[PDB]
Amino acid sequence: MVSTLKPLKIGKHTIKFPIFQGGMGVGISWDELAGNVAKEGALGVISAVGTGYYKNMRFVERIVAKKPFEALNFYSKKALNEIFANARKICGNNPLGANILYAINDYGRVLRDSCEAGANIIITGAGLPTNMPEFAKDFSDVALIPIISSAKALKILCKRWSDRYKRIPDAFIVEGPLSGGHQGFKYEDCFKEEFRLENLVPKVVEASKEWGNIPIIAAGGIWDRKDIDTMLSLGASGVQMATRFLGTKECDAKVYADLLPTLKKEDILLIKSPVGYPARAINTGVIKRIEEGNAPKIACVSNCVAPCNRGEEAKKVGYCIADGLGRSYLGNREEGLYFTGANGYRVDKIISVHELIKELTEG
Ligand SMILES: Cc1cc2nc3c(=O)[nH]c(=O)nc-3n(C[C@H](O)[C@H](O)[C@H](O)COP(=O)(O)O)c2cc1C
Ligand SMILES: Cc1cccc(NS(=O)(=O)c2nnc(NC(=O)c3cccc(OC(F)(F)F)c3)s2)c1
Numbered sequence: 001m002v003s004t005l006k007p008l009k010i011g012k013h014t015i016k017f018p019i020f021q022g023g024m025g026v027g028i029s030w031d032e033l034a035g036n037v038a039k040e041g042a043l044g045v046i047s048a049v050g051t052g053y054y055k056n057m058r059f060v061e062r063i064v065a066k067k068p069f070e071a072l073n074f075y076s077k078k079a080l081n082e083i084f085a086n087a088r089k090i091c092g093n094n095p096l097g098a099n100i101l102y103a104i105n106d107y108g109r110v111l112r113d114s115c116e117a118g119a120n121i122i123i124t125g126a127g128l129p130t131n132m133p134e135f136a137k138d139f140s141d142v143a144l145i146p147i148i149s150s151a152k153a154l155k156i157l158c159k160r161w162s163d164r165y166k167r168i169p170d171a172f173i174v175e176g177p178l179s180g181g182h183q184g185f186k187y188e189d190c191f192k193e194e195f196r197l198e199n200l201v202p203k204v205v206e207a208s209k210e211w212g213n214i215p216i217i218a219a220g221g222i223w224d225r226k227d228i229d230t231m232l233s234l235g236a237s238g239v240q241m242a243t244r245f246l247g248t249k250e251c252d253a254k255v256y257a258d259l260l261p262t263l264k265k266e267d268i269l270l271i272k273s274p275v276g277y278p279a280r281a282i283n284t285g286v287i288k289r290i291e292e293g294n295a296p297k298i299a300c301v302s303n304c305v306a307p308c309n310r311g312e313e314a315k316k317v318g319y320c321i322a323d324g325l326g327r328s329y330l331g332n333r334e335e336g337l338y339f340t341g342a343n344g345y346r347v348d349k350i351i352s353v354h355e356l357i358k359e360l361t362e363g
């Protein structure tokens with residue numbers, strides 16, 4: 001209950017602790033996880049990706065081969081609405097974010113859906129989101145947060161936003177190469193010292209000074225309060241963490257509770273992705289099936305991401321990311337796709353969100 005961490009302002013919103021639970025798709029950070037995180041005083045973040053899978057396609061208009069048909073159903077507005085409402089049954093009006101990647105042609109629709117669902121913050125990476133305010137202008141109080149990989153991206157985004165909208169971002173998350181999910185770095189660059197988070201944060205904070213010290217949130221490989229304190233000492237205003245929350249009871253993808261306590265370091269690796277960025281995965285499920293010659297068939301139903309071009313890149317890399325992540329949410333160990341941060345092997349227990357926040361914030 002006693003902490004020396006200080007509340008963090010993001011636009012017009014305040015969070016008690018300077019910690020974001022990072023968004024995780026598909027079906028990983030929905031209502032149970034994000035609601036309980038926000039209940040604790042950190043930023044809970046609802047993933048807006050693949051919401052058509054929620055409660056086994058509760059809210060889709062059309063299904064093909066047990067998949068949400070095309071992007072209107074893969075990014076399901078009614079599912080998103082119910083996820084936000086169920087989160088707020090837990091956390092009330094405590095701030096909540098919505099995470100949506102940029103590499104989708106329906107980006108604006110899903111951003112406005114997130115706002116209309118009640119999001120207080122929009123977080124967007126996997127691209128250079130130079131036009132978030134275009135889609136958010138009917139919702140003036142929703143704070144807007146790009147995820148970036150470099151100080152150069154901060155400068156470019158601030159200039160484009162300032163010139164076009166007379167607005168700059170409310171915060172930036174800088175994500176490093178030890179993160180879960182996709183990496184904002186080429187595979188080779190993921191192992192270079194120059195791209196370590198401890199080296200990125202000073203440069204991004206220095207770049208931020210020119211635009212009035214927009215708060216910088218450090219993400220990727222942050223495990224405990226020692227790492228939080230390091231990142232704050234380097235000029236970050238807060239941290240975003242996901243792998244620790246991936247190992248909590250309240251995670252909405254229940255498979256992880258059984259998978260992480262077994263997970264060995266040598267079974268974490270970077271793979272190719274139809275999104276076009278390296279993804280950090282667990283060497284299990286669909287990955288193993290591909291190597292056996294038992295790969296699930298690929299035929300684009302959900303049309304989840306623009307770089308894939310309706311199956312072109314999925315066929316080249318060997319797997320559909322929408323199908324695999326949906327299968328994981330629905331419980332499929334044999335054919336699911338599973339992501340993790342580099343630190344995933346350090347999960348031994350599955351603990352509650354409350355005990356995790358206590359660990360991270362006490363003192
Ligand atoms: C399983 C998993 C799924 C993720 N999915 C997303 C996602 O859909 N969108 C996003 O912006 N980041 C995603 N991430 C990145 C996290 O939000 C976060 O920035 C990163 O994992 C933080 O590093 P840490 O896991 O070491 O704390 C994902 C991470 C994990 C582990
Ligand atoms: C600028 C830049 C570039 C690359 C990475 C970062 N860093 S980042 O924005 O924090 C991210 N890290 N991992 C991410 N993963 C996803 O977006 C993702 C995960 C699952 C499903 C999904 O949707 C589907 F199925 F593909 F349609 C999308 S995004 C920042």
Ligand code: SF4
Pocket residue numbers: 274298299300301302303304305306308309310311312314319320321322323
């Ligand atoms: S085939 Fe490509 S675009 Fe279609 S759902 Fe799969 S990964 Fe997404």
